[PDB]
Amino acid sequence: ITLEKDIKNLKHDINEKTQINEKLELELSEANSKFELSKQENERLLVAQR
């Protein structure tokens, strides 16, 4: 019973760290998109100035 409770607790830990990793991957993709958009927008603005 103790080992089953340990497995269950470690499964909630798996789920929590998996939500954390899903948030991290969403934030990584969002950071990549924000880079490409923002750097292209700054390029457009600097090109208008140029």
Binding site: L10, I14, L24
Partner: protein, 50 residues
């Protein structure tokens, strides 16, 4: 009769419970594999990228 049906039968149930204990320990080791070398390793690489 007492041994075969009560004492040795209880010992057989105890051996089955010990086998279940070993299976739970193996499942726990697999969860640390998926967790430490996995979801924590995935967390580390995701945090590095982020």
């Amino acid at each position: 009769r007492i041994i075969s049906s009560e004492v040795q039968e209880s010992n057989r149930t105890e051996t089955e419970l010990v086998g279940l204990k070993q299976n739970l320990i193996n499942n726990k080791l697999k969860l640390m594999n998926v967790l430490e070398t996995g979801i924590m390793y995935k967390l580390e690489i995701l945090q590095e990228q982020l």
